[PDB]
Design an enzyme around this catalytic site. Structure first.
Site, PDB file in Angstrom:
ATOM      1  N   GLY D   9       0.567  -1.546  -0.189  1.00 43.42           N
ATOM      2  CA  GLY D   9       0.103  -0.003   0.017  1.00 43.42           C
ATOM      3  C   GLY D   9       0.924   1.487  -0.249  1.00 43.42           C
ATOM      4  N   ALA D  89      -5.346   1.181  -8.384  1.00 41.48           N
ATOM      5  CA  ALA D  89      -5.850   1.254  -6.942  1.00 41.48           C
ATOM      6  C   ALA D  89      -7.210   0.349  -5.820  1.00 41.48           C
ATOM      7  CB  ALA D  89      -4.483   2.828  -6.243  1.00 41.48           C
ATOM      8  N   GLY D 133      -7.437   1.064   3.471  1.00 44.28           N
ATOM      9  CA  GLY D 133      -6.874   1.638   2.341  1.00 44.28           C
ATOM     10  C   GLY D 133      -7.457   0.025   1.064  1.00 44.28           C
ATOM     11  N   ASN D 196      -1.994   6.296  13.020  1.00 45.67           N
ATOM     12  CA  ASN D 196      -1.638   7.446  12.811  1.00 45.67           C
ATOM     13  C   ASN D 196      -1.795   8.532  13.536  1.00 45.67           C
ATOM     14  OD1 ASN D 196      -0.588   9.178  10.819  1.00 45.67           O
ATOM     15  ND2 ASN D 196      -2.248   9.301   9.100  1.00 45.67           N
ATOM     16  N   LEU D 242      12.308 -12.959  16.831  1.00 44.98           N
ATOM     17  CA  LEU D 242      11.213 -13.121  16.798  1.00 44.98           C
ATOM     18  C   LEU D 242       9.809 -13.653  16.868  1.00 44.98           C
ATOM     19  CD1 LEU D 242      11.317 -12.052  12.915  1.00 44.98           C
ATOM     20  CD2 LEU D 242      10.921 -10.372  14.655  1.00 44.98           C
ATOM     21  N   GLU D 244      10.401 -14.954  19.394  1.00 49.87           N
ATOM     22  CA  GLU D 244      10.288 -14.872  20.982  1.00 49.87           C
ATOM     23  C   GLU D 244       8.629 -13.973  21.175  1.00 49.87           C
ATOM     24  OE1 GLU D 244      13.496 -14.347  23.693  1.00 49.87           O
ATOM     25  OE2 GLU D 244      13.918 -15.837  23.005  1.00 49.87           O
TER      26      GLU D 244
HETATM   27  N1  LIG Z   1       1.694   6.911   8.954  1.00 49.46           N
HETATM   28  C1  LIG Z   1       1.282   6.747   7.870  1.00 49.46           C
HETATM   29  N2  LIG Z   1      -0.188   6.742   7.895  1.00 49.46           N
HETATM   30  C2  LIG Z   1      -0.059   6.987   6.633  1.00 49.46           C
HETATM   31  C3  LIG Z   1       0.169   7.000   5.715  1.00 49.46           C
HETATM   32  N3  LIG Z   1       0.547   7.147   4.458  1.00 49.46           N
HETATM   33  C4  LIG Z   1      -0.768   6.902   4.183  1.00 49.46           C
HETATM   34  N4  LIG Z   1      -1.451   7.089   6.214  1.00 49.46           N
HETATM   35  C5  LIG Z   1      -2.589   6.409   6.541  1.00 49.46           C
HETATM   36  O1  LIG Z   1      -3.184   5.156   5.397  1.00 49.46           O
HETATM   37  C6  LIG Z   1      -4.672   5.221   4.832  1.00 49.46           C
HETATM   38  C7  LIG Z   1      -3.920   5.700   4.015  1.00 49.46           C
HETATM   39  O2  LIG Z   1      -4.706   4.557   2.700  1.00 49.46           O
HETATM   40  P1  LIG Z   1      -4.237   5.176   1.613  1.00 49.46           P
HETATM   41  O3  LIG Z   1      -3.645   5.489   1.079  1.00 49.46           O
HETATM   42  O4  LIG Z   1      -5.775   5.837   0.964  1.00 49.46           O
HETATM   43  O5  LIG Z   1      -4.566   3.798   0.465  1.00 49.46           O
HETATM   44  P2  LIG Z   1      -3.531   2.604   1.081  1.00 49.46           P
HETATM   45  O6  LIG Z   1      -3.413   1.237   1.580  1.00 49.46           O
HETATM   46  O7  LIG Z   1      -2.453   2.743  -0.265  1.00 49.46           O
HETATM   47  O8  LIG Z   1      -3.897   1.485  -1.127  1.00 49.46           O
HETATM   48  P3  LIG Z   1      -4.758   1.676  -2.125  1.00 49.46           P
HETATM   49  O9  LIG Z   1      -6.251   2.499  -1.492  1.00 49.46           O
HETATM   50  O10 LIG Z   1      -5.039   1.244  -2.756  1.00 49.46           O
HETATM   51  O11 LIG Z   1      -4.783   3.819  -3.068  1.00 49.46           O
HETATM   52  C8  LIG Z   1      -5.305   6.732   6.446  1.00 49.46           C
HETATM   53  O12 LIG Z   1      -5.226   6.504   7.164  1.00 49.46           O
HETATM   54  C9  LIG Z   1      -3.441   7.440   6.104  1.00 49.46           C
HETATM   55  O13 LIG Z   1      -3.932   8.341   7.565  1.00 49.46           O
HETATM   56  C10 LIG Z   1       2.470   7.402   5.940  1.00 49.46           C
HETATM   57  O14 LIG Z   1       3.046   8.233   5.151  1.00 49.46           O
HETATM   58  N5  LIG Z   1       2.066   7.002   7.835  1.00 49.46           N
HETATM   59  N1  LIG Z   2      22.653 -14.898  35.850  1.00 53.04           N
HETATM   60  C1  LIG Z   2      22.387 -14.819  35.013  1.00 53.04           C
HETATM   61  N2  LIG Z   2      20.805 -15.295  34.310  1.00 53.04           N
HETATM   62  C2  LIG Z   2      21.079 -14.525  32.685  1.00 53.04           C
HETATM   63  C3  LIG Z   2      21.947 -14.926  31.719  1.00 53.04           C
HETATM   64  N3  LIG Z   2      21.039 -14.515  30.043  1.00 53.04           N
HETATM   65  C4  LIG Z   2      19.962 -14.628  30.925  1.00 53.04           C
HETATM   66  N4  LIG Z   2      19.950 -14.546  31.995  1.00 53.04           N
HETATM   67  C5  LIG Z   2      18.201 -15.353  33.466  1.00 53.04           C
HETATM   68  O1  LIG Z   2      17.916 -16.669  32.107  1.00 53.04           O
HETATM   69  C6  LIG Z   2      16.384 -16.229  31.788  1.00 53.04           C
HETATM   70  C7  LIG Z   2      16.533 -17.091  30.625  1.00 53.04           C
HETATM   71  O2  LIG Z   2      17.643 -17.110  30.276  1.00 53.04           O
HETATM   72  P1  LIG Z   2      17.936 -17.173  28.448  1.00 53.04           P
HETATM   73  O3  LIG Z   2      19.583 -16.841  28.134  1.00 53.04           O
HETATM   74  O4  LIG Z   2      17.469 -16.345  27.528  1.00 53.04           O
HETATM   75  O5  LIG Z   2      17.778 -18.647  27.905  1.00 53.04           O
HETATM   76  P2  LIG Z   2      18.013 -19.165  26.291  1.00 53.04           P
HETATM   77  O6  LIG Z   2      17.148 -20.416  26.544  1.00 53.04           O
HETATM   78  O7  LIG Z   2      18.834 -18.929  26.062  1.00 53.04           O
HETATM   79  O8  LIG Z   2      16.894 -18.048  25.134  1.00 53.04           O
HETATM   80  P3  LIG Z   2      15.825 -18.954  24.006  1.00 53.04           P
HETATM   81  O9  LIG Z   2      17.424 -18.931  22.769  1.00 53.04           O
HETATM   82  O10 LIG Z   2      15.214 -20.044  24.634  1.00 53.04           O
HETATM   83  S1  LIG Z   2      14.805 -17.080  24.386  1.00 53.04           S
HETATM   84  C8  LIG Z   2      15.831 -15.262  32.587  1.00 53.04           C
HETATM   85  O11 LIG Z   2      15.330 -15.398  33.624  1.00 53.04           O
HETATM   86  C9  LIG Z   2      17.064 -14.052  32.697  1.00 53.04           C
HETATM   87  O12 LIG Z   2      17.092 -13.510  33.416  1.00 53.04           O
HETATM   88  C10 LIG Z   2      23.617 -14.271  32.479  1.00 53.04           C
HETATM   89  O13 LIG Z   2      23.825 -14.182  31.668  1.00 53.04           O
HETATM   90  N5  LIG Z   2      23.334 -14.461  33.707  1.00 53.04           N
END
Ligand SMILES: Nc1nc2c(ncn2[C@@H]2O[C@H](COP(=O)(O)OP(=O)(O)OP(=O)(O)O)[C@@H](O)[C@H]2O)c(=O)[nH]1
Ligand SMILES: Nc1nc2c(ncn2[C@@H]2O[C@H](COP(=O)(O)OP(=O)(O)OP(O)(O)=S)[C@@H](O)[C@H]2O)c(=O)[nH]1
Ligand SMILES: Nc1nc2c(ncn2[C@@H]2O[C@H](COP(=O)(O)OP(=O)(O)OP(=O)(O)O)[C@@H](O)[C@H]2O)c(=O)[nH]1
Ligand SMILES: Nc1nc2c(ncn2[C@@H]2O[C@H](COP(=O)(O)OP(=O)(O)OP(O)(O)=S)[C@@H](O)[C@H]2O)c(=O)[nH]1
EC number: 3.6.5.-
Lengths: 429, 426, 117, 429, 426
Positions: D9, D89, D133, D196, D242, D244
């Protein structure tokens, strides 16, 4: 810790700029914020190289706070801490308290909650307002109001500039001051009072000048105040905390109002004359012509005085100069009070403006106290009120601003028991 | 071992700086330095006040209790201020309000546990504990309230070790505070029932004794403090030195307290002559008893001449004849048979160290248990009533979680304490 | 004073409390609110509470009651949960005032509400 | 690992150009592609000098993608990766999803299958679309649709910009957003949401500027987003993959939509002021005036927050600043979630545009979360829909585009159980 | 002998870097360098943790297991990171999802065989194997799941050699994850039934102990880790040193586990004083037991004072009197008879090495088996139910090929484990 400060009303702001000036002046911090804990109870070390202000500024017309952000010191505060309501001031309580003043309060508070957080175990907020104003009477009324609830667990010492005994300004003044008293009464800890007129006398009689600009009276309170917070929160041979005050200074919950007095007020140009003795200044304190308040001890029995000294002072000199006084009798102290003399000794002598008109001695006495005297000052100010209320005078100006026959009549009755209070706690044994 | 000093409040603290300023020099301990001791005897008994860690760092074993930072931050930022291990500083950044109630029930009560903690770390130091030294003023919060609590707790933890208390009872003529009798009456109460040796000093009894017995014209606090600290050194530390006839806290206690109240004394130093001139050296001995036993020269406010004595302890410390000492004491006991109580054949407790105050030839601390101190608690007790009657600044107490029966209690107690003391004056 | 408040609280709640610090747990505060409102989930409140984690739950419950009712009064859990005397003393004093004004005529059975805990 | 991204969009493309800008900006890779693994989870080291993007661009009008191939960055992507349908569009779902949008999809997919192959064990596709949009709602609907089947075994975090609460643009908006929600719901993993309008407030209240060009809101999300992928997929003291997210962020299969929030939003020109404390920013996170979403925690109980920090941060500072929060109970109480605070700590501080209007602190908090709050936002957006559908309003525009009374009515019922869902998973114990 | 460390997950890994950062210096092994050992004794027993190949390259014999490249690629791209033979790195470039199920049944289960492979290459190294050290966190995938598998396999391959487990049980106040109790309850389950010595550390028990027992204001992770690694060095490696009375994993095991559960301990280090100042040297010995046996200072979250002990092992390592050691332990056992369980006349297991921690004069690792740790599995177990009840983030487990009866299992098991532990507190 520290002790925040909220300068409310143009005046409270002018006086503020002043008291705020004297400060850096005796702390080696140029208007640029930079100096080359101790005093941290009034200044936050934003980093960093600067100092900034540990207070805020509240006026509903920009004019006055504007001038601060023009003249050096412009650099001192944070662009933020100077609150304004472009709207209208209005020399009327109601409008400032209720109607308009309301809109700003939140925001106002926010700073005294944002500035109150940043610190480390504070002690309270030194409030600066001008009793008989619009932004000064009303507003604060609810500011201090909203404080007593948000931090009941602290000190609320409000430094006021109550109505000149005959030389008032606003036509309504009393309306605005009988209203700031009743609303703040049940919220302050200790209310310091400095009479605008009775300070002029000092400028005429104890300094000689028929050219006293507001900028002077401000330098003065700007002095007496420096003796309160500044230096006191500053190490010494007999430290006195803010709490200390209210404790050693108020005998009763009424946010009791002591009076501020300073000892060495002598004009530069006199600056060379042989200095005054520890005994003289001490004695000058018992003269009804040197007390920043037209409440001449016409009968008012003192009931507690906090003699804050600063500079080169020998504790015996005091624990003698005071002894001599305790036995002058014509200085009659209350009955129920054996000894009511809180001797506060600081080290660093005062610090006079480079070239204003203040002598510049090496020792001073900023004695403040609760005197059955104000029985007067309140009386004379209450009476005023009636006369006008008796005819509603400028009443339509408040009513139409979210107030009622209640708030007036019911705030009159209020002070009534302040005329009886300040009467009962004294004159009787 | 031993003893552990306690600097309660600002005053008690300010004085700490002077008591330690002295004592150290009377033990050759420089700021953080060690024992430079001009001699070798100022070391075999130090333990009483220090601890071995480094080998040049014998740290004072005291406690610094206060709810006002600035204070301890003035004592810790000045001269000897950097000798105390930081662990010693039990501060209370709270609002050190001038309320006995604010430092005994509400604010101090919190900081207490974090104190007792240390008072135990120091007690369980080593060897055998004797007692604790306590400095403070009965005219404020951190002093009378919080310090008076510190002991009520100490005396529950070791009802064996002794408790000397150095109180700065509210001077008459002028009170350096307003509620004074409130903070006072309330602390004396706690005293008459925990510590078992109290040495009451009066800021104005000192001035006098410091402006006329020392032509000293500008008696700064430092001085007063200094004079006081001079006496508390003669007492303790001193006796922890050799002597033909030495005593120690207990002897002092077990010879001075006829009746369990605890009773309060009034210390007096010996050579108290102005610098240059006066340096008369008339210190053969009759000159010291001349001194010590006169009215003026009693750090107390009251005058002995106004009431018999129960006990007296001339703790001398400087080479002298157990004859010219033991003797003098007698005539003294006979020239003044009038005031010296009779049911005690020998009121006086002669004590005799050897080494004198560093730079002096002969001195003698005086610890009097006279019935005269009746006329002081009277004073205090009066001031109370005159103001209690109207509940003057009472809201600052109650509003802090206090009781209308608490004040009643203390006054009475301490008021009765006046009564009793008369039971012997007669 | 502490003595007066404790006496009042013990009689009202039928509690043992020796000292103000005990209030730090937050149970009593919740029950005081219960006497007034009777809305509180008493079963949920850890009356007996030994451990801090339990205290937190009581605080949350207390906070919720304030919010539900629209009670402006501030509650600083961090301070209270410590079981420090001053903070609790102050809070209890306010609560008593609140109770005095708010409490209705209806009788309250503290034991039953607790489930005799 | 990597995570492809499909900016769909015009908007999703404008925001794309933005988020894509901030990127190189904090990775030292000039617009020419060249810099002088780590971040390989978003950039492929094609040729032996360059850094061809790792995403694609889909718009049915050329206008917007065209501008990308004019302004420096022109050099950044591959001429190929920017898909267009010269056609039309149409601000209507139907047409974009069914009718027109269809024709392009194949081709679109091809890239997300051609770009998905070239890599090394990827994690998912960060999708960028604008809910209300034509090309953004419709199209994606089937793009994400065709993904959930071709790679069910991955993460589908779609970053949306859902309908301004009162300041919408398109007249139909809801039609297009009740339709992109129902079709994507059963296909996304975690849908991030940035409002927005509620971002404008931040530009008015927390940065001050009544001149916010779209190019700004984009710089903002362009920031909050950088905190998601960029830095996170980047080594640190407490990495957060992610996967996570969706795991620690979605309690239930509904492609649950958390909200994005950033901590330090302060305007340059403020740039010098003493920086904010670890505690303040943390606290700023619990303020309903700083969350890029008009879903003020009006009641919505949080149910899981992923506090992603970046810059100089001490784990205790966090494992304390959060503790303080856990005991504020701002949220109010559901029973079921004991602890719902995923603390993500990165090293490299944020990276503000050289001279936009973003402060530039040395630490920030991009906290996102699922809040029973959206119970609102969805509600208020659903209601909208009805009003119009209730009269068929612009219905003939979709029907005539290969849709039916079915898809509408049957996508309405859809969200209905999203108003009950977001209600049941909370408000009850 | 010997032992073979195991760095499961990121945490367990991050810590590896700190455990080896230390240990090496406590054995003079520079990055790839050899034995620079200030002494000659830090070598006669190294084998326990290394292998001989070159002649200057004694490579740590540990395993680095993790499904997230970036991690091991941070540990291998930093300081000592270049001492591990690459063969040691058993990575899983897969999606190291934060799911116990994703690293124990679906993703980890694959990478396992390629691990066991090495855990055998290292075990069959030489001489005689004692056991394996295991570091990880019970609040994630690669930690609780995959590492908890690594052991279930290890304990099938050598039910003879021991298994010490260093677990970072989910801190209370604030958890560093959301499903935490899920990944946890599930791993403790595996622990209570494979490893036979577990040392549970709490990121917040550390902060505390690291921000108040070390005025340290900015306790970075590196630190916490560092402190922990300090204890695990006192345990193992240490005892593999001489001593008037030395022990070794088994002694530690055969004196600390009364009942087969495996039981978990709570390690505590001795000299834990802030840098400059504190350097009080009050380490005669009563000072170390003072330390070790206090509440705070127990790396665990729970406080001993909240439940008896079954066993205790003061593994000291610094020249001291088998008298002032054997003695102290006693008073300690009598001042606290209350909490120390009775059906064991001498709970304490005094151990005494000789050489101390490189730069220190005297230290003593504490390994407590107190019933207090009941109040932690309770915690964990609670969090589970409160969220299990609603199957919170359960789809991330099941959807990974799990069972609704699997979670039931663990909780119960580990939940019963709480029960039992109380059977002795009474
Ligand atoms: N934060 C932010 N919101 C935006 C921006 N451009 C548009 N919007 C918001 O997104 C919506 C607008 O969508 P449009 O630009 O009309 O449409 P589109 O989603 O690009 O797709 P079409 O309808 O097919 O053109 C409104 O709610 C705007 O306020 C931008 O650059 N930043
Ligand atoms: N003492 C100590 N605690 C730690 C350390 N790193 C993480 N923790 C503790 O361990 C827990 C999570 O550990 P983490 O290291 O994230 O595990 P992981 O298995 O490696 O995590 P993932 O890869 O699945 S997200 C939390 O309770 C955090 O407070 C460290 O270096 N020292
Ligand atoms: N000492 C002193 N008194 C002042 C100063 N400015 C004003 N005052 C006095 O304070 C009162 C004036 O209040 P105003 O300035 O009218 O009003 P305000 O309180 O600022 O607020 P508003 O009515 O809304 O404008 C009069 O009694 C003045 O004499 C000053 O700078 N110093
Ligand atoms: N001799 C002597 N007396 C002192 C000293 N400091 C204060 N005082 C006396 O002690 C009393 C008050 O002592 P102060 O030190 O203010 O107590 P505090 O508890 O620390 O006071 P606060 O913190 O509640 S206001 C007064 O009677 C004063 O004259 C000192 O350094 N020496």
């Amino acid at each position: 810790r520290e002790c925040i400060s909220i300068h409310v009303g143009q005046a409270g702001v002018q006086i503020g700029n002043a008291c705020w000036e004297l400060y850096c002046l005796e702390h080696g911090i140029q208007p640029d914020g930079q100096m080359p804990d101790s005093f941290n109870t009034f200044f936050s070390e934003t980093g960093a190289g600067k100092h900034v202000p540990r207070a805020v500024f509240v006026d509903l017309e920009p004019t006055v706070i504007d001038e601060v952000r023009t003249g050096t010191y412009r650099q001192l505060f944070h662009p933020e801490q100077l609150i304004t309501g472009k709207e209208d001031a209005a020399n009327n309580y109601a409008r400032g308290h209720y109607t308009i003043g309301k809109e700003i309060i939140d925001l106002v508070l926010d700073r005294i909650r944002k500035l109150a957080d940043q610190c480390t175990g504070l002690q309270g907020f030194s409030v600066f307002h001008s009793f008989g104003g619009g932004t000064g009477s009303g507003f604060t009324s609810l500011l201090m109001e909203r404080l007593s609830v948000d931090y009941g667990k602290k000190s609320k010492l409000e430094f006021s500039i109550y109505p000149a005994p005959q030389v008032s300004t606003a036509v309504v003044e009393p309306y605005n001051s009988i209203l700031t008293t009743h609303t703040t009464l049940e919220h302050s800890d200790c209310a310091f009072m400095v009479d605008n007129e009775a300070i002029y006398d000092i400028c005429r009689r104890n300094l000689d000048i028929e050219r006293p600009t507001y900028t002077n009276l401000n330098r003065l309170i700007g002095q007496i105040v420096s003796s309160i917070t500044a230096s006191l929160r500053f190490d010494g041979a007999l430290n006195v905390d803010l709490t200390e005050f209210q404790t050693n200074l108020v005998p009763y919950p009424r946010g009791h109002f002591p009076l501020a007095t300073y000892a060495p007020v002598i004009s530069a140009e006199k600056a060379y004359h042989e200095q005054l003795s520890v005994a003289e200044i001490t004695n000058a304190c018992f003269e009804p012509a040197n007390q920043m308040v037209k409440c001449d001890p016409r009968h008012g029995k003192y009931m507690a005085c906090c003699l804050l000294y600063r500079g080169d002072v020998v504790p015996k000199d005091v624990n003698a100069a005071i002894a001599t006084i305790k036995t002058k009798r014509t200085i009659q102290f209350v009955d129920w009070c054996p000894t009511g003399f809180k001797v506060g000794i600081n080290y660093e002598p005062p610090t006079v403006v480079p070239g204003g008109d203040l002598a510049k001695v090496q020792r001073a006495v900023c004695m403040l106290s609760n005197t059955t005297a104000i029985a007067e000052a309140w009386a004379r100010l209450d009476h005023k009120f009636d006369l006008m209320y008796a005819k509603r005078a400028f009443v339509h100006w408040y009513v139409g601003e979210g107030m009622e026959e209640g708030e007036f009549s019911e705030a009159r009755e209020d002070m009534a028991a302040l005329e009886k209070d300040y009467e009962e706690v004294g004159v009787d044994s | 071992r031993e003893i552990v000093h306690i600097q309660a409040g600002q005053c008690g603290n300010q004085i700490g700086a002077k008591f330690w300023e002295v004592i150290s020099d009377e033990h050759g301990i420089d700021p953080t330095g060690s024992y430079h001791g001009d001699s070798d005897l100022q070391l075999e008994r130090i333990n009483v006040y220090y601890n071995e860690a480094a080998g040049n760092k014998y740290v004072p074993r005291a406690i610094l209790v206060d709810l006002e930072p600035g204070t301890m931050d003035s004592v810790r930022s000045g001269p000897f201020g950097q000798i105390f291990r930081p662990d010693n500083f039990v501060f209370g950044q709270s609002g050190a309000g001038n309320n006995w109630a604010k430092g005994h029930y509400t604010e101090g009560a919190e900081l207490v546990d974090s104190v007792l903690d240390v008072v135990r770390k120091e007690s369980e130091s080593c060897d055998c504990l004797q007692g604790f030294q306590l400095t403070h003023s009965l005219g404020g919060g951190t002093g009378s309230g919080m310090g008076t609590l510190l002991i009520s707790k100490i005396r529950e933890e070791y009802p064996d070790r002794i408790m000397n208390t150095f109180s700065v009872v509210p001077s008459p003529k002028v009170s350096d505070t307003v509620v004074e009798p409130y903070n006072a009456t309330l602390s004396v109460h706690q005293l008459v029932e925990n510590t078992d040796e109290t040495y009451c000093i009066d800021n104005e009894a000192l001035y006098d004794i410091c402006f006329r017995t020392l032509k000293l014209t500008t008696p700064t606090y430092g001085d007063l403090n200094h004079l006081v600290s001079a006496t508390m050194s003669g007492v303790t530390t001193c006796l922890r030195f050799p002597g033909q006839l030495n005593a120690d806290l207990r002897k002092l206690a077990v010879n001075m307290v006829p009746f369990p109240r605890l009773h309060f004394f009034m210390p007096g130093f010996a050579p108290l002559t102005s610098r240059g001139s006066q340096q008369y050296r008339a210190l053969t001995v009759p000159e010291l008893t001349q001194q010590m036993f006169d009215a003026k020269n009693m750090m107390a406010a009251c005058d002995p001449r106004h009431g018999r004595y129960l006990t007296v302890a001339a703790v001398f410390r400087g080479r002298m004849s157990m004859k010219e000492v033991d003797e003098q004491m007698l005539n003294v006991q006979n020239k003044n048979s009038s005031y010296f109580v009779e049911w005690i054949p020998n009121n006086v407790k002669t004590a005799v160290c050897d080494i004198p105050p560093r730079g002096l030839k002969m001195s003698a601390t005086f610890i009097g248990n006279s019935t005269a101190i009746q006329e002081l608690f009277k004073r205090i007790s009066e001031q109370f009533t005159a103001m209690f009657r109207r509940k003057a600044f009472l809201h600052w107490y109650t509003g802090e979680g206090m009781d209308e029966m608490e004040f009643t209690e203390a006054e009475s107690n301490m008021n009765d304490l006046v009564s009793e003391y008369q039971q012997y004056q007669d | 004073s502490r003595q007066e408040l404790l006496a009042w609280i013990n009689q009202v709640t039928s509690l043992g409390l020796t000292r103000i610090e005990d209030c730090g747990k937050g149970y009593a505060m919740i029950q005081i609110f219960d006497s007034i409102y009777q809305d509180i989930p008493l079963k949920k409140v850890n009356f007996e509470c030994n451990n801090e984690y339990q205290y937190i739950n009581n605080w949350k419950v207390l906070q919720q009651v304030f919010l539900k009712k629209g009670i402006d009064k501030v509650v600083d859990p961090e301070r209270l949960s410590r079981c420090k005397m001053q903070d609790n003393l102050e809070f209890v004093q306010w609560a008593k005032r609140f109770w005095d004004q708010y409490y209705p005529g209806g009788d309250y059975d503290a034991l039953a509400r607790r489930g005799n805990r």
